[PDB]
């Protein structure tokens, strides 16, 4: 199956306190493997998964230098952006950045990303072809022009297509015991009438990895459903995930309805009966 | 592996 590697950076200015809170996190698929928090005592890039602890001190020194560089560039950005948006020193503002790689089942490059946001909105992004910039407004055009003069997109093209996929491949290999696994979901059926009869029903799924699941409700019909409630995938903490989908049906005991569960690794699209 | 190029100020 496909895989990805991505890094998330958030910097929040806190005027009247000092430097901005800066938090950086790295993921391989849905697994966090590194982090950096400007308020932590460590002041080092920290491992958050066993297979990354295999890298030597040279690697950690480098990641730490780079992540601090990122931090300080974002601190300069905060000052520059206030100017661009003609805003005051008193207000707290946020800068965000994300970039990464996607590869297919063949572990070959599929697509890259590099985007930036200001105060929760798109500011500038690198287009799908990794050659053009999507600038949100006038301020971002300024940035766009300087990033073009300095060939930022050529540099990111080199990182995203080469370095990021080469390292994604290395990480998948080093942690094949964890990253290259697949945990099947433990499904269930819960329907309570409690006070008023009218029975309901949702497809449970526990302890599954990765987080991608496409469960849906229907009875002997085609892929079309209409409801007003369902829950998004959520973390369990042990590294796994859990989700469900609700739909309303006629009163009485449990009727005859099929649940289509789609998850990777899983032998075949599971559909729990439980008619008692 | 963090990017070590293509990261500039806005």
């Amino acid at each position, epitope marked *: 199956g496909s895989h990805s590697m991505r890094y998330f950076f958030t910097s929040v200015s806190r005027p009247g306190r000092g*430097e901005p809170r800066f938090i950086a996190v790295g993921y391989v698929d849905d697994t966090q493997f590194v982090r950096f928090d400007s308020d932590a005592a460590s002041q080092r890039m920290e491992p958050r998964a066993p297979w990354i602890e295999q890298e030597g001190p*040279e*690697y950690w*020194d*480098g*990641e*730490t*230098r*780079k992540v*601090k*560089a*990122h931090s*300080q*560039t974002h*601190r*300069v950005d905060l000052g520059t952006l206030r100017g661009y948006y003609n805003q005051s020193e008193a207000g707290s503002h946020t800068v965000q950045r994300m970039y990464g790689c996607d590869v297919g089942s063949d572990w070959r490059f599929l697509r890259g990303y590099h985007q930036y946001a200001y105060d929760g909105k798109d500011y500038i992004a690198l287009k799908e072809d990794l050659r053009s910039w999507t600038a949100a407004d006038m301020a971002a055009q300024t940035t766009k022009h300087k990033w073009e003069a*300095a*060939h*930022v997109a050529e*540099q990111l093209r*080199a*990182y995203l297509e*080469g*370095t990021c996929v080469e*390292w994604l491949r290395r990480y998948l290999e080093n942690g094949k015991e964890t990253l290259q696994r697949t945990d099947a979901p433990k499904t269930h059926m819960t329907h309570h009438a409690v006070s008023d009869h009218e029975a309901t029903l949702r497809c449970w799924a526990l302890s599954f990895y990765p987080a991608e699941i496409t469960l849906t409700w229907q009875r002997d019909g085609e892929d079309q459903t209409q409801d007003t409630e369902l829950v998004e995938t959520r973390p369990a903490g042990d590294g796994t995930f859990q989700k469900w989908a609700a739909v309303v049906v006629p009163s009485g005991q449990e009727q005859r309805y099929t649940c289509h569960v789609q998850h990777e690794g899983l032998p075949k699209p599971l559909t729990l009966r439980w008619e008692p | *592996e963090l*990017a*070590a*190029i*293509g*990261i*500039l*100020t806005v």
Partner: T-cell receptor
Amino acid sequence: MSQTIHQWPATLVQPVGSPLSLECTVEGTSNPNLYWYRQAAGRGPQLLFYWGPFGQISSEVPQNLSASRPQDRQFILSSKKLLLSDSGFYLCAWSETGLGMGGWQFGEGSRLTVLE
Amino acid sequence: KQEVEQNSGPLSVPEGAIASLNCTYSFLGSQSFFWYRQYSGKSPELIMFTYREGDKEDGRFTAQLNKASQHVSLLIRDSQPSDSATYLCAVNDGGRLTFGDGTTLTVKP
């Protein structure tokens, strides 16, 4: 109008135990990365300090040496008491804010000879 | 050091010939590479940088990068005596440059 980097003094001959003060200035860019290297004969420059625009990023901790950055474009290397070992060719360098291809130029260096 | 290795030389090359300077690095995460020229008693002067596979030509200088073998080269075309100097190879291993000890070149007129 363009980008420049200067260093001084150019050469120093000084006794063991003496204080040291080298300066580095840059013009034509703002919020740059600043670096202090030391070069021994027959070898490549070795990193002493790497400061980003708001402070020190490098973890090396030399002996008798400290760096400071009183202004955005002013970088200082000091010692309160030099050791014979501190002889060397001290080089300052800069790079643009962030992690990019801009800059990476050295100043003209400061040759220091410490004598017993 | 050992992180970045270059032959020391002195490497002699006739005037008019191509000088081939080589460099090996051991830091897998290196994403950019640089070549400096250093005249005796002087500070290093930047020649080129590269961050992608293959060749990159700038006048008579051609840097070649091969990441699989972790090798970086510099070819000087139509060498001259004024090219006599020590050529430094540097690798960016984060937010800084790490240097080799250089390869001293001598071009006989």
